[PDB]
């Protein structure tokens, strides 16, 4: 079978979630994606801060 | 900060009498508690020898009462004019005087109010 019309959370693998998986998660994939985006922003921020006098 | 203790006030008066008046950096290097602007503000507020810290009379109260209505704000402008010149005794006297004394259709209406 196919999935429902819900919004599945991404975890670097598009899985075939079915049998009414209406928002069943602990909050680990979204927190990891937000931490990865924050690290990718903070690396550019630290590079811009260290490239102040250079 | 700026507690303005008596031992600091005597040292500030001695520094104002010894060093000078228009040298605020020279007076701030012998107190180790306030900056030069705070020392100049203290010398212009409480350590000034021309400040009348007492003798609140009825003539000054009538002068301040006949001045707070002409200018509601700008109490610093009326500081030297009233004679207190402390910039805080005027507001305190105003607060004491306020606390002690406390303890088109519209026109058509008024037009017919006189005609009736």
């Amino acid at each position: 079978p196919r999935y429902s019309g819900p919004a599945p959370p991404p975890n670097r693998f598009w899985p075939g979630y079915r049998w009414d998986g209406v928002d069943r998660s602990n909050g680990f994939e979204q927190k990891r994606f937000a931490r990865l985006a924050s690290k990718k922003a903070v690396e550019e921020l630290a590079y811009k801060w260290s490239v102040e006098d250079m | 900060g700026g507690v303005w203790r008596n031992t600091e006030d005597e040292i500030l008066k001695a520094a104002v009498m010894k060093y000078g008046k228009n040298q605020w950096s020279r007076i701030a290097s012998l107190l180790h508690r306030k900056s030069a602007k705070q020392c100049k503000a203290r010398w212009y507020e409480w350590l000034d020898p021309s400040i009348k810290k007492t003798e609140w009379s009825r003539e000054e109260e009538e002068k301040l009462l006949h001045l707070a209505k002409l200018m509601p704000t700008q109490w610093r402008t009326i500081a030297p004019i009233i004679g207190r010149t402390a910039a805080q005794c005027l507001e305190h006297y105003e607060f004491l005087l306020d606390k002690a004394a406390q303890r088109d259709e519209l026109e058509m209406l008024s037009e017919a109010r006189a005609r009736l």
Partner: protein, 754 residues
């Protein structure tokens, strides 16, 4: 400085000595006009500090962030600035206690400590900048952001006083341009129509506005305690190094409450400038607020004579239209008031310099008469104690049957609009930056728009370049290069298309960039090199060079492009292929970057497509993706990143971005590149990128850059991690292999030693 402070001292002792106020009867009429106007718009009073507010802590964090970002930037101090930074940090550590302190001060202390002042010299016109004591500044700053927050939530200041959060300059320019274009049959005059554009500063709203009327206006605006606080901390004391003049003659300039102060002064003065009825009509019905200039119906556009009238903080711009019989009546009233015997109305009119041969204001009889007339009427209708305007200072151009050109000079550089149906002049369009404007209903090219750079800002840019070129020998070469890059990145962005199309401005920057290069050269050597080879000047920073942002043509030394490497045989010289014509260095934006006109066009397109894609995604019940948000994320209006960022929850509750920035310019000394935006609220528009890429490609890349450097000499392996009176020496050695040669210094003979 000592003289002008003595002058203010004399004027203040005068205005208190004589009590010579602002004509009490006219004052009472002004207060009544204000009370009636505010009631007609039905604005609520501004509530005093809600002690447990949802607004409170968020506003305090925003204001403290602005105060920190200004007062500390990088690695400077004082002792006063140290105590300021320390109280700032304590506030960011124990925020509710600080909000308690601020509330207690604003409701209690109706006095002030002695403020500081010393002027700074943008050498054309000196603009003095006042400094305050620390905790008083913090409390006033939270009060100021509170005042603007409640002001925007109440919509009290109208859409007349337009200096606020659309953008900074270019949007107001294009807006007033297209608004002057899309008026109802206004560029035509076959039945003897006439139009007039005025521009005049009120010229005294820094030293006229009286404290008591300010207190009453603030009483009609906000509560009694905040009114007393604003008035009292408008009254402190000014002390430069020795003298000490008292205060309370008029408003202090740089204190943080100046935003709401001068804006309400503009809202008051603009009503008596225009008229209450016509100002209500051109403003809005209080139910339906109105747009950037756009009046509701055709009827209110038709009825009054004065069509549209906006202002930034000091300018006023009012395209006062006049029907013909009214024009004859106005000219009659003008000549009967001020008879002119020998046609001396044309004895001195100001004009422009925009190729003044075919597009200056073509001085003819009724036209020059109408100009002096409209100024006579607007002068006589001005509240003469407070707000005047000088016919020497203004610049009043007239578009009629005769002068087919029209020249209105907004906050940007001056603007010339000349419709096709009047069969206009040359306007040769030296660049492709001709200001086009489509007629809003017909979707038709009603008019063209030329826009040349303005002389005052041009001489200001020249002044700062001379400041840098006179600041030599006390700084490293890196700081000189950084400052030239800073000033060019400013003055090719905010006067953008005008810098492309004003040929004298194009020529001035070219010689000045060569001049700064000359200053770097005469620093490097002492004997004024025959040809300082262009690489170690114009090459990029991180690869160990000076990174001039060069907005001027300079062909490379065509023989200075050889790569050389000993691989498995011996020397394999690897020269560039530049026999096409000649390798240019790289073009200061212009063609490289996009124009502000196309930026405005695509901004409207991108924001409309993002909202339509949001509608389609709400239909298909999906979250929007990084792909569709990357299909944009350009700029459109403001920025798409300004929807994406952390401010989307955080910094929504502040308005008054640009107005706060201009007051910050008057507030701190560093005359920044700061009118043109403010990155957080507006975003990142000044978009370099591709520029460094193209310069690396032109300079032949690192292969050639290292070849002209001494990078082969360390014999480290390849292009990798290379980068990390001192720094001048490091530049000297890292380009010594190109800065030390007879060709680069003609008369060489030395063998040093060893």
């Amino acid at each position: 400085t000592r003289l002008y402070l003595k002058a203010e001292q004399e004027r203040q002792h005068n205005y208190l000595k004589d009590g010579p106020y602002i004509t009490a009867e006219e004052a009472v009429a002004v207060y009544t006009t204000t009370v009636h106007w505010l009631e007609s718009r039905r604005f609520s009073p501004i509530p005093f500090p809600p002690l447990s507010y949802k607004h409170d802590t968020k506003l305090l964090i925003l204001a403290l962030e602005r105060l920190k970002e200004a007062y500390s930037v990088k690695s400077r101090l004082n002792q006063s600035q140290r105590e300021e930074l320390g109280l700032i940090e304590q506030a960011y550590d124990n925020p509710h206690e600080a909000l308690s302190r601020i509330k207690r001060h604003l409701l209690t202390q109706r006095a002030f400590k002695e403020v500081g002042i010393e002027f700074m010299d943008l050498y054309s016109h000196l603009v003095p900048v006042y400094d305050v004591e620390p905790l008083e500044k913090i409390t006033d700053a939270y009060l100021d952001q509170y005042l603007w927050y409640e002001a925007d939530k109440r919509r009290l200041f109208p859409p007349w006083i337009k200096p606020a959060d659309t953008e900074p300059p270019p949007l107001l320019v294009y807006k007033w341009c297209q608004g002057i274009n899309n008026l109802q049959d206004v560029w035509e005059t076959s039945e003897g129509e006439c139009n007039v554009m005025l521009e005049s500063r009120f010229e005294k709203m820094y030293e006229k506005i009286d404290l008591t009327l300010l207190n009453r206006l603030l009483r009609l605006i906000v509560d009694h305690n905040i009114a007393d606080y604003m008035t009292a901390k408008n009254n402190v004391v000014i002390n430069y190094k020795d003298m000490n003049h008292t205060n309370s003659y008029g408003i202090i300039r740089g204190l943080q409450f100046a935003s709401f102060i001068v804006q309400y002064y503009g809202l008051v003065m603009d009503l008596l400038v225009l008229g209450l009825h016509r100002a209500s009509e051109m403003a809005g019905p209080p139910q339906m607020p109105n747009d950037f200039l756009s009046f509701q119906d055709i009827a209110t556009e038709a009825a009054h004579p004065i069509r549209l009238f906006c202002r930034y903080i000091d300018r006023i711009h009012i395209f006062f239209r006049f029907t013909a019989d009214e024009a004859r009546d106005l000219i009659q009233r003008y000549l009967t008031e001020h008879p002119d015997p020998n046609n001396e109305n044309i004895v001195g009119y100001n004009n422009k310099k925009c190729w003044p041969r075919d597009a200056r204001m073509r001085l003819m009889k009724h036209d020059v008469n109408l100009g002096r007339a409209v100024f006579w009427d607007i002068k006589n209708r001005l509240p003469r104690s407070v707000t005047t305007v000088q016919w020497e200072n203004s610049f009043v151009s007239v578009y009629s049957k005769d002068n087919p050109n029209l020249l209105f000079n907004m906050c940007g550089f001056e603007c010339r609009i000349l419709p096709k149906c009047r069969t206009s002049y040359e306007e040769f369009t030296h660049k492709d930056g001709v200001w086009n404007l489509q007629n809003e209903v017909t979707k038709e090219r009603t008019a063209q728009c030329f826009l040349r750079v303005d002389d005052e800002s041009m001489q200001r840019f020249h002044n700062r370049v001379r400041q840098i070129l006179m600041a030599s020998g006390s700084t490293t070469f890196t700081k000189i290069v950084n400052k030239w890059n800073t000033a060019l990145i400013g003055l090719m962005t905010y006067f953008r298309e005008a810098v492309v199309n004003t040929q004298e401005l194009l020529d001035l920057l070219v010689k000045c960039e060569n001049k700064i290069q000359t200053r770097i050269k005469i620093g490097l050597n002492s004997k004024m090199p025959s040809r300082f080879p262009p690489v170690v000047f114009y090459t990029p920073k991180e690869l160990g060079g000076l990174g001039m942002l060069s907005m001027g043509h300079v062909l490379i030394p065509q023989s200075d492009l050889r790569w050389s490497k000993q691989t498995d045989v011996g020397i394999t010289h690897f020269r560039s292929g530049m026999s096409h014509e000649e390798d240019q260095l790289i073009p200061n934006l212009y063609r490289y970057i996009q124009p502000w006109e196309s930026e405005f066009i695509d901004s409207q397109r991108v924001w409309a497509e993002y909202a339509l894609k949001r509608q389609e995604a709400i239909a298909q019940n999906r979250r929007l993706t990084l792909e569709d948000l990357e299909d944009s994320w350009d700029r459109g209006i403001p920025r798409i990143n300004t929807l994406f960022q952390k401010d989307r929850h955080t910094l929504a509750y502040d308005k008054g971005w640009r107005v706060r920035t201009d007051f910050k310019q008057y507030q701190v000394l560093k005359q920044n590149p700061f009118w043109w935006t403010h990155q957080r609220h507006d975003g990142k528009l000044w978009n370099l990128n591709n520029y460094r890429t193209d310069m690396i490609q032109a300079l032949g890349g690192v292969e050639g850059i290292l070849e002209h450097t001494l990078f082969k000499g360390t014999y480290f392996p390849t292009w990798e991690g290379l980068f990390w009176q001192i720094p001048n020496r490091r530049f000297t050695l890292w380009w010594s292999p190109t800065i030390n040669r007879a060709n680069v210094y003609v008369g060489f003979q030395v063998q040093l030693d060893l």
